Amino acid sequence: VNIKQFLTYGRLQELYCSVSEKNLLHTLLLKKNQERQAQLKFRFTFHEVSKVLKDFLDDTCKGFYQKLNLPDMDRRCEHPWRDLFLWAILQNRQEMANYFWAMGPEAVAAALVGCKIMKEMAHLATEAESARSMKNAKYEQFAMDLFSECYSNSEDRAYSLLVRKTCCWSKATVLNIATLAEAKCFFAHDGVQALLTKVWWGAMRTDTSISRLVLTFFIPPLVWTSLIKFNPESATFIRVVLRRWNRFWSAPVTVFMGNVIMYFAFLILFSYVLLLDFRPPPPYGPSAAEIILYFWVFTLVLEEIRQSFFTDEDMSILKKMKLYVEDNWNKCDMVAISLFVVGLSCRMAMSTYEAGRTVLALDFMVFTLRLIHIFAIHKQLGPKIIIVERMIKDVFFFLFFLSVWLIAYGVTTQALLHPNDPRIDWVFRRALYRPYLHIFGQIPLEEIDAAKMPDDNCTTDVQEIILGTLPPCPNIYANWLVILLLVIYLLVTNVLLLNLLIAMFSYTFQVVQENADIFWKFQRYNLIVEYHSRPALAPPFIIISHITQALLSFIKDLLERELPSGLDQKLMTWETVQKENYLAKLEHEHRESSGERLRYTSSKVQTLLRMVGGFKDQEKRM
């Protein structure tokens, strides 16, 4: 059977029509067909499967069958193995999907597509067994192992494979398909991380020392010295020096260093303005440093807006805003800009001047917190941030138990100790603020224990208590109960709950570290990709880059590259050969496994015993 000649578009349509009506694909096609019929031979046509693929693969499958609107039923499928793989994946037929993947031209991208579709269908599966099978699809493992073979073979053709635009998946890069598939473990592979490191260091050698890089950054003339080694590949001299300067100063690592230094400068300036150079309203006027700070924040907002909305040519504005608000650090950034605007507005007025100062102090807090996210690309700091995010839940469990016990103890002690105090603020003080401070070793026995209570003259009159002329007299009717309750509450909270929280953090760290590291590698991919369109000038100098780009656009990458036809064919042939080697090695290591040897020995011993018994019968006859 010749699948290229066997599989036409008609047979593919017939295969899509002959769904067993008991799995997910039939229900999805039913919904799509009902929608198509309402909006108005074969039970389903290629438009329904195109819509299903769109739901799973937003634009990876664009033009697979819409382009010709359905194609000719009599024509051979251009990518028959791709179509069969998609058809088998869409209905959880993993054995045929494995076969069609092993028989396909572009297997890493196909495996990533299968991973994406399987994890998309795992949410839609009604039965638990099918959902479990989809959740154990192990197609990302196939992609990882095939790329391991490819990276071991060449390690240079592997990067080209990672960055080349695939023919069978609508010019989608393998890294693009991995990002869409959200393949954490594929991005954690050593080859992908090495390519990311090569991109990160730019034109410089990846073994460049950090100290020499910092010394070259602080002292620009050292760029032209041989202190920093670079990766190979009057007017001539000017061109050479300009090329060296632009090669050093446009690498992602130097851009990151400049951004970090300028953010430290921004925090220093913000704190100087807030603490030492904050002036009365415009009647007297904001200081010059405050105006520079306003301009600085304006440049920061421009960089954020550009990076978030002015980087993708084809992408929905509403979808871009949803992507922006989906990130919690972006929520922090919006909180920071809102606080800055509100504080500036209030500061411009005399009646709201102090409120403006307060809001600007909160804004400094928020920006200094953003400083944590700035260092998310560090090799050792990012996974720790992810680990903290994972331990927030143990923090919340401790907080639930502590809150219950704290409310009980605080309200009971308030009732037992100051029954006659009507002030709501002091009720809440003694009921929540004091027991909370008991956790941090702040135990003020001077107002809990009668023997320790100072004998300053104090009133029992309600009006005098409300007016604040004298403190209220703490009731000491049954103080043994107050002391006993304090003892029990201290025991519970400061021993059991605190050390239980310590134990929970220990266990969570030990069980989370590895997944946190894989997540960090996936996040590091996106962080490094963000520097491709990021200008080399840090704020506030980034205004120059913004103006230059805007003017160039109005007047007039290492990743995701398109190769010539010959090289692209050579690379796909090399990928197929590597896949054949991988499959042969798998079948070999299976064939000389202990279990297969035992099976072979048992079967052959049984057959040999039967044949020798026949021979013995013949000998007895003879």
d(CA 548, CA 565): 36
Q: How far is the CB of 470 from ligand NAG (least distance, A)?
A: 8
Closest listed residue to residue 139, CA positions, set 168, 165, 100? 100
Task: Kindly indicate which of the ranges 260-268, 328-336, 486-494, 558-566 contains the residues binding Ca ion, using the contact rule CB under 5 A.
Answer: 328-336
451 binds ligand YUV (CB under 6 A): no
Binds ligand NAG by CB under 6 A, chosen from 207, 233, 425, 456:
456
- Looking at this protein, which amino acid is placed at residue 444? P
Q: How many residues bind Ca ion (CB under 5 A)?
A: 2
Q: How far is the CB of 455 from ligand NAG (least distance, A)?
A: 8
Binds ligand YUS by CB under 6 A, chosen from 288, 348, 381, 388:
388
Binds ligand YUY by CB under 6 A, chosen from 143, 144, 359, 406:
406
428 binds ligand YUV (CB under 6 A): yes
330 is in an annotated binding site: yes
Tokens representing 32 are 């799509």
Which string of x and - marks every residue 411-450 that binds ligand NAG (by CB under 6 A)? ----------------------------------------
3-state DSSP of 251-312: CHHHHHHHHHHHHHHHHHHHHHHHHCCCCCCCCCCCCHHHHHHHHHHHHHHHHHHHHHHCCC
13 is in an annotated binding site: no
Mark residue 417 as left, alpha or beta (left: phi above 0; alpha: psi -120 to 50; beta: remaining): alpha
Is the Cβ of residue 240 or residue 481 nearer to its own copies in the bound state? 481
457 binds ligand NAG (CB under 6 A): yes
Which string of x and - marks every residue 412-451 that binds ligand YUY (by CB under 6 A)? -------------x--xx--xx--x-------------xx
Neighbouring C-alpha atoms within 13 Å toward the C-beta of 483: 12
Tokens representing 132 are 């479990």
Q: How many helices (H) and strands (E) does the chain have?
A: 29, 0
Neighbouring C-alpha atoms within 13 Å toward the C-beta of 179: 17
Task: Kindly indicate which of the ranges 246-254, 424-432, 533-541, 608-616 contains the residues binding ligand YUV, using the contact rule CB under 6 A.
Answer: 424-432
321 binds ligand YUY (CB under 6 A): no
Task: With beta carbons less than 8 A apart as the criterion, state whether 402 and 493 touch.
Answer: yes
d(CA 520, CA 188): 9
Q: Which of residues 463-502 bind ligand YUY (CB under 6 A)?
A: 468, 476, 480, 483-484, 487
381 binds ligand YUS (CB under 6 A): no
SS3 (DSSP) at 396: helix
Other C-beta atoms within 10 Å of 255: how many?
A: 18
Task: With beta carbons less than 8 A apart as the criterion, state whether 559 and 532 touch.
Answer: yes
Closest listed residue to residue 7, CA positions, set 63, 101, 78? 78
DSSP 207-229: T--HHHHHHHHHSGGGGSSTTS-
d(CA 485, CA 477): 15
Q: How far is the CB of 383 from its own copies (least distance, A)?
A: 10
Residues facing residue 512 across a β-bridge: none
290 is in an annotated binding site: no
Is the Cβ of residue 437 or residue 558 nearer to its own copies in the bound state? 437
Is the Cβ of residue 479 or residue 515 nearer to ligand YUV in the bound state? 479
Q: How far is the CB of 328 from ligand YUS (least distance, A)?
A: 3
Task: With beta carbons less than 8 A apart as the criterion, state whether 139 and 130 touch.
Answer: no
Binding-site partner at residue 127 among ligand NAG, its own copies, Ca ion, none, CB < 5 to 8 Å by type: none
| Length of the chain as a residue count | 622
Q: How far is the CB of 609 from its own copies (least distance, A)?
A: 5
351 binds ligand NAG (CB under 6 A): no
Tokens representing 437 are 């401070």
Q: How far is the CB of 338 from ligand YUS (least distance, A)?
A: 14
Task: Kindly indicate which of the ranges 46-54, 170-178, 191-199, 385-393 contains the residues binding ligand YUS, using the contact rule CB under 6 A.
Answer: 385-393
d(CA 464, CA 524): 63
Q: How far is the CB of 407 from ligand YUS (least distance, A)?
A: 12
327 is in an annotated binding site: no
Task: Kindly indicate which of the ranges 67-75, 329-337, 355-363, 448-456 contains the residues binding Ca ion, using the contact rule CB under 5 A.
Answer: 329-337
Is the Cβ of residue 330 or residue 352 nearer to Ca ion in the bound state? 330
Closest listed residue to residue 427, CA positions, set 438, 436, 415? 415
The CA radius of gyration of the chain, in Å to the nearest whole number, is: 34
d(CA 53, CA 108): 19
385 binds ligand YUS (CB under 6 A): yes
Binding-site partner at residue 456 among ligand NAG, its own copies, ligand YUV, none, CB < 5 to 8 Å by type: ligand NAG
Binding residues for Ca(2+), as ranges, are 304, 307, 330, 333, 530
Binding residues, as ranges, are 304, 307, 330, 333, 530
Binding site for ligand YUV (CB under 6 A): 424-425, 428
